[PDB]
Structure formats: C-alpha cells, structure tokens
C-alpha cells in the first residue's frame, strides 16, 4: 500500500541537468522526510540529502549541496532530485527512501524504498591530450603535442595556455582551422605553433627556456562565437632545471575470457603509478610489484581481466622522478 515510485533510467552526457522523480503514495507524504541514497557498483551506499515535504525544508551532504537539488510538490505528491553538471563519478543507482519514525524518533529507519534509478554519464567523446618532455634544461627548447579526438582541426581552433606554479593562466597562442596563428605579443619571439590535421595533432615549441617556463602546459578548444575556450586537456607538466642526473624512465609496451594489460619497463628511480580508465576500472586488475632488472633499471606489468572492441581500455602511467605521465590503449 505505502509505495515510493521512481522515474526510469537516465542516459546522460557530461554537463546535463538530469531530474529524477519519486512519487510517494499510500501514506501521508507530508509526515516523513524523503531521503536520497546513491549506490555505485564498487562503493556501497551513500547519503545525498533529505527533504521535508510538509513545507519544503532541505539538508544535503556538504558534497552534493550545490550539486544535487531536492524539490517537493504536494499537489503531485512527488519528490525530485535535480542533479546538474554530472561526471562518470555519478554513475550510480539512485534510491529515494523515507525516514519512518515511531514514538517521536524512538526508532527511525528507511523502511520503504523506491525501485532505484540508474543514472549513467557518457565518456565525453571530445578529447584533448597534451604530452611532452617532463624535464628540460635552461636556454634549451620545449616541444609539446596536443592530440585531439572526436572533432577535426580543419574547422576547430586550438589555444596553448600555460599555468606557471603560483602564477595565473597565461595565454601563449592559438591556431585557427584555416591555419591562421596568433601569439601573445610578449612571448611572440620565442613561440612556434603548428598542426597536422591528418594526424589529429597540434604542436608547441618554446625556446630560451628559463626556470619561469616551469608550468602546466594546456591545449584548449574554442567553442562557437564568442570563441571562449570550452574544452581543455588535462595538461602536461614541464619543469625547467640545470640538472636531472639521471634522467628518464617509463617505456609503456602493450599486452575463453580476455586478459589485457601493459608493461612499464626500464625506469629509474622507482616507483611507477598505474591505473586504468583514469580510475574507472579497478575490477580484475593486477598491478604487479616492481623487480630490479639486469639493466639496473626497474620494471613492472599491469594486467586487467575483461570480457570479449567497444569498451575503451587506457592505462594511466606516472613516473614522478622524471616528471612523466603517459596514457596508452591496447588492441590485438
């Protein structure tokens, strides 16, 4: 008789304003607080917030405060959870429940629950991936590469923006789809921007590198008019110093049910950090402990057991002593 009826599954893309209903019947909707619990396949159960249907009072978890938004209409006897700008962190089952109370909260618990609402957030599709040499000497040259995916360079503009540690964002230059290049007047002399539309790649070169060129170097795509920068890459760190003896590392090689992984070989010094899908894959993963090779360098393998060409598998390799961070896919 007493039921909490929830709205269907959600196909959501990053940046959506998804709203899930939960109409309550068979009781006094106005008498008990409606709560919201998020699941997720690999976590457990978490508290989003709660609403008072009698007036409209709210209290959310500090986390989902400005994120999730709880609404109530006693004319339709429904409670809403308006979740804006979601990510593949909000890929969970969402239950609406009530905190039923006996004897003025002598006993209070979630007795009746909604069937659940599976909310799923898409994997972007537009990607920008910066990469370059972690370390470089003064008076030397930097060379970075922006690797674009899900759009073409023939008609999209790419900006090179850097963030020095403790400094603000500093615009370096841009390459328009028609090949027009624009530079910062101040650093014009030292910068060279170019692209390879065929290879889906953009490049930046900076000369006479002094220590104040130590920065996270980003590539950002222009949206349509007014041409604000609507998509950014994760950035690539470039540290500038006289010595880094010695010197580089992390070389990433590829590797019934399907087993696949990557080999991180000949790196010094230890350690190397490895994860898959930027963390969105911890299932059947085996990140083997490193072993000191014959070549005095270190080595390890990271494998992951998965079902049998649709799901994307990328390992996130980080060898901090060389300021290296690399991402790679695996295919037969």
């Amino acid at each position: 008789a007493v039921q909490l009826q929830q709205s269907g599954p959600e196909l959501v893309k990053p940046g959506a304003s998804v709203k899930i209903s939960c109409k309550a019947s068979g009781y006094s909707f106005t008498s008990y607080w409606i709560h919201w619990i998020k699941q997720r396949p690999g976590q457990g159960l978490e508290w989003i917030g709660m609403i008072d249907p009698s007036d409209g009072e709210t209290r959310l978890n500090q986390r989902f405060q400005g994120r999730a938004t709880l609404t109530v209409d006693e004319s339709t006897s429904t409670a809403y959870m308006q979740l804006r700008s979601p990510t593949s962190e909000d890929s969970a089952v969402y239950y609406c429940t009530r905190l039923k109370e006996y004897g003025n909260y002598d006993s209070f618990y979630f007795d009746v629950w909604g069937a659940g609402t599976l909310v799923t957030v898409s994997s972007s599709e537009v990607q920008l991936k910066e990469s370059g040499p972690g370390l470089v000497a003064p008076g030397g040259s930097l060379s970075i590469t922006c690797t674009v995916s899900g759009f073409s360079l023939t008609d999209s503009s790419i900006n090179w923006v850097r963030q020095p540690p403790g400094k603000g964002l500093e615009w370096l230059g841009m390459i328009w789809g028609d090949g027009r290049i624009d530079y910062a007047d101040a650093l014009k002399s030292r910068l060279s921007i170019s692209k390879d539309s065929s290879k889906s790649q953009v490049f930046l070169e900076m000369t006479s590198l002094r220590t104040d060129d130590t920065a996270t170097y980003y590539c950002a795509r222009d949206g349509y008019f007014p041409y604000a920068m609507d998509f950014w890459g994760q950035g690539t760190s470039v540290t500038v110093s006289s010595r880094t003896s010695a010197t580089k590392g992390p070389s990433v090689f590829p590797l019934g049910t399907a087993a696949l992984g990557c080999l991180v070989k000949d790196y010094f010094p230890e350690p190397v950090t490895v994860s898959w899908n930027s963390g969105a894959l911890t299932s059947g993963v085996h990140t083997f402990p490193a072993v000191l090779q014959s070549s005095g360098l270190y080595s390890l393998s990271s494998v992951v057991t998965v079902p049998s060409g649709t799901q994307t598998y990328i390992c996130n390799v980080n060898h901090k002593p060389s300021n290296t961070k690399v991402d790679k896919k695996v295919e037969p």
Binding site: R59, Y109, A220, M229, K265, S301
Partner: protein, 327 residues
Amino acid sequence: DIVLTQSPASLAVSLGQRATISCRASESVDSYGQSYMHWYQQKAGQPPKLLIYLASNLESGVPARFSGSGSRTDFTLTIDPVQAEDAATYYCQQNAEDSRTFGGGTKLEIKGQPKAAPDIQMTQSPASLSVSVGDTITLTCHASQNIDVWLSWFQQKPGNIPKLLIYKASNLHTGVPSRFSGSGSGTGFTLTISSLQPEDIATYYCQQAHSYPFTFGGGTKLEITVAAPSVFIFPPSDEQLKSGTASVVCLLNNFYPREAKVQWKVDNALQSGNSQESVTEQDSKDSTYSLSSTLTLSKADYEKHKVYACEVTHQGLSSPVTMSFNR
C-alpha cells in the same frame, strides 16, 4: 595586449554568503555592444572550466548562483549563495583582440575557521564470507564514533533493492524471519543467522542514524578451496623489438593455494634463464594470488625462434599446462 587585473587575489567566504570577484581591463573589451569577457573556474589539480561568456551568460550546467556583470573595463563575477564546491581559482579572459589574455586569478576557499565536524566511518569485516545451509552464523560491524544503538542492518540481493532487516541494533523489521538476530551497542554490533536458508544469500549492509550525514558499512557478501591459474603468455610487442629487447610475460591470473611452479620453454627446450617473478598479495574477495614470469632477453637470442611456451605446475592442474604462441 590588454592587461586584466583581478581583485582580490584571494578571498575566504563562509558557506551561504555572497562573494564578488572583480576584473578590470586596461582597454575596453567591448565591440559592437558586446563585452568579450569570459570567466573560468579552475578547481585544484584540474583544467579550467567555462562558467560565464560575454560577461553575463552562464554556460550550460552552470548553477543560477554564478552571475556576471560589467562593461567596457569593469566586470564582476558573483556567487550568491557560496557553496562548498565553489572553492577554486577563478579567471577572467578577453578575446576583444587577436591576442587573448587572462587575469591573475582569484582563489576562493571556503573559510576555514570554525571548520565543522567529521563524518562517521562504518566497517564490515570481512567483505566476503562462506558457509553451508542449516548453520548459525555471526556477522561483525564497527563504528568510528558513538552511535549508541542507532544501527540498521540491510539486505541486498544482486540486482535487487536494500531490504531493511534489523533496526535499533536488536530490533527486527516486519516480515523478517526469527532466524535473523541483532546485538551490540556503542561502536560494535553483530548480525546472527541461525540455521541459514538459501534465501539468506546476499550482501549484508549496516547504517548509522546518530549524526548527519548518514553513513553505511562497506559490505559483506554471502556465497556457500583450490583454484587453478588462468595461464596466458604474452609475446614482446612491435614497439619493444625496435628497442633491441624481447620480454615474454607468462600470466597466472587467479590461483589458490600459493604453491605453483612456472617453467620457461625456449622453443621446445626447457631453459631456466634470465627471468624474474612478480606476485600480488592474498586477496580479500577470493584470497587467490596472481603471478607473472618475465624472461628478459635481447632481440639477438629471440627473433630466431617464432614459437615459445610456458610450463605451469599447480595442484589445481592434474598435470602441467604449457601455453604457446605463433608470431
């Protein structure tokens, strides 16, 4: 090259307040009735994200709390009310010229003093357990702080909703069989299933209702010892051979017990050579191990042989298994 000056360089705001950041430009940022001034929000260790464009337009998925105004050389970004996730550095940007510039930034942190209070941490050990049908079983739960007796014990069958079983540590919810039982107070509580039926197989949760926010336990899976390794062999990629090196990796995925022998087969010839083993720790899910064997040798000794194997000796295997490849 227009210079954009932000104000203040930093601000500490109390939750639910108004915060007004400024951005002044050296020359007008206006062209044909439009202000080519945009705001970006950069959270810690993250790329910037567009919030406001042409001074007053919100981007899609940007809360009604962010707003911007101003014209010519004087602009402002306002967050009213200020929320916990609004702590970031905020940058103004201009494209009124061929050469775009950004401002210094305004770092906004939520203050800070007085802080708040911590959140309760629940733990269910072990995360997985097994037993027959018709036996008494005791499950264990723990709390980080005191909850007196405000503990619920839930039941979730795979692909099913949470089912309340026990509330107030020892009370049984309606429709719950007499075989289920609750006990404990303070920081430690126990579920108890006497003469366990097949229906009592699901993931058993726990929840605190003392202090806001409410927190649940990890989980405890029900199921009802030997395991042969899933033996695979990986050849060195095209990328690696160009380096003048060849590494063959023998994968032994999930096996119990630990005692397992791996023997390298150099093209029909058993040779204990330049190899090294790696091994994972005894798991919580199935308590099985994972082993790799990596026979590291130059492209001078390898490229000749086109077919290689890996001999795996384990209790789980009636006689050793030898996984091979053809390049």
